[PDB]
Amino acid sequence: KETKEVYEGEVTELTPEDAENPLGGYGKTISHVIVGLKSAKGTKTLRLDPTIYESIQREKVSIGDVIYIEANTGAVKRVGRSDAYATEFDLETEEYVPLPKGEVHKKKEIVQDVTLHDLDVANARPQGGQDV
């Protein structure tokens, strides 16, 4: 049995923590990009890990495109650019998609059955990852 958190919405903000107070130790800047998750039904500014922002950079997202992130793993997948930017380009390889309906923060539970030796091989050998 397992439970995770669901998030969706389009992207407008690519800014780190401003950190107005220097404190004498910070040339204020961080590899933690604060993004206001612009879903049509909700918006929240998140301090994001360098890994999830690195995956954001992997998708090379721009302003105005739906994103999907995870609270725990931070997995980043984009359905594509929004239909608002469809008229900007007469042609574009990136698919123009509408914003999926639903709240920003959604919670789902799984009771998936996994055999013992899949966990055996995963523990003996890590399965994989997007990082170098």
Binding site: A40, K41, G42, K101, E103, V104
Partner: protein, 411 residues
């Protein structure tokens, strides 16, 4: 005279009837004369045969009414004719009281002329000149059939109601509190029934021959087969092939009104020599202009922009109270699967913590509006609300239309 008279004027059609009967009497508000010059009474254009070239001369304009004598002539016809109005009877109307509706944005001088005329020539013993949105929160005073739509889910009168009102003249948005609408948050939609008729005429000219001369046919086709897109535009466009309707035009000699032949039904097998104009693409495109005015290539903001502006500038505490009660009134709200789309797109556009809750009345919403004004008279507040002749007489004529019936009073 305990039962007053209920008159609900309109730029297109005026709703009128006594306080006793349930169903209001109907009469179009427009004067039409044929190309040969034969004028037709407003209730008799439906009786004429030649509907090809008709020029309409209505006293109402895009904003309001101007011709006082022609409109007074219209009312004199509509309230002095018991022979053609069964059950109705009104000889002179001294003690008979009036329940009159009007726009929230009446001009000072035009309102002056209107109140002067109604008080001094029609001797209304007492009357209440107020917009429909004021009578709207009195719906809870009576129990009856009423339907509601939820956006999220897949005294004797209420206070916090959001009023959406659409008519042939125009469309308006009104937030009302304690029974007095929030005037500064009331906004107007420029798209009216006349604009819809004109754009249908233009699209038909671009897709068929010229029907700009025809006007009754365009209203008939926009009234009998136009429906709102249930979900969006692209799905309807892809499914417009199966959602294809063919309308048989009315031959002037045998059929005064045409019929829409549905291919899916076999109940109409008789063939006709008259040509049939097929319709597959414009069935849902026209109502999509409300959500997406850009499909008509117009620079209007849109319904969602207006509602979000009105709510945002409105005080924050009563915004959820506003969106907790939405009711649709007017003729244009009779289109199918429309307010469900409004609820869905509000819920998409409104924050999760808020809940969208729009209630829809069955059938014509203008009839429900007439019903609500009629039942407003039964309320114990109306007898306090009505203003007599003398208070108009001794006081200056501007006082009655500026203080109690003046929009500047509650601004």
């Amino acid at each position: 005279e305990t039962p007053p008279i209920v008159i609900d004027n309109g730029s297109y059609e005026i709703k009128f009837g006594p306080s006793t009967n349930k169903k209001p009497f109907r009469a179009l508000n427009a004067l039409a004369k044929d190309k040969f010059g034969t004028s037709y009474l407003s209730n008799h254009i439906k009786n004429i045969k030649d509907i090809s070239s008709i020029t309409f001369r209505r006293p109402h304009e895009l904003g309001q009414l101007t011709l006082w004598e022609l409109e007074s002539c219209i009312w004199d016809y509509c309230l002095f004719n018991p022979s053609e109005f069964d059950g109705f009877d009104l000889k002179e109307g001294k003690g008979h009281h009036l329940v009159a509706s009007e726009s929230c944005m009446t001009l000072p001088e035009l309102s002056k002329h209107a109140d002067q005329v109604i008080f001094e020539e029609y001797e209304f013993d007492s009357l209440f000149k107020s917009p429909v949105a004021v009578f709207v929160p009195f719906t809870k005073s009576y129990k009856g059939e009423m339907r509601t739509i939820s956006g999220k889910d897949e005294s004797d009168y209420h206070d916090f109601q959001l009023v959406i009102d659409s008519g042939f003249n125009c469309t308006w948005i009104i937030p009302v509190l304690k029974g007095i609408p929030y005037y500064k948050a009331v906004k107007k939609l420029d798209i009216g029934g006349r604009f819809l008729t004109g754009l249908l005429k233009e699209t038909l000219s671009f897709r068929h021959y010229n029907m700009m001369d025809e006007t009754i046919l365009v209203n008939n086709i926009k009234e009998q087969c136009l429906f709102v897109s249930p979900v969006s535009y692209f799905d309807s466009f892809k499914t417009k092939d199966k959602h294809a309707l063919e309308y048989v035009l009315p031959d002037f000699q045998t059929s005064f009104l045409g019929y829409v032949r549905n291919p899916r039904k076999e109940n109409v097998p008789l063939p006709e020599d008259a040509q049939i104009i097929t319709l597959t693409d414009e069935l849902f495109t026209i109502p999509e202009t409300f959500f997406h005015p850009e499909i008509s290539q117009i620079t209007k903001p849109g319904i969602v922009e207006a509602i979000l502006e009105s709510l945002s500038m409105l005080p924050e505490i009563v915004r959820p109270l506003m969106v907790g009660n939405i009711v649709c009134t007017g003729g244009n709200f009779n289109l199918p699967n429309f307010a469900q789309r409004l609820a869905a797109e509000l819920q998409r556009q409104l924050p999760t913590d808020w809940t969208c809750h729009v209630s829809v009345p069955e059938g014509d919403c203008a009839l429900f509006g007439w019903e609500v004004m009629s039942q407003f008279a039964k309320t114990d507040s109306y007898r306090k609300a009505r203003v007599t002749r003398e208070e108009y007489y001794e006081h200056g004529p501007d006082w009655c239309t500026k203080h109690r019936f003046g929009y500047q009073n509650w601004i």
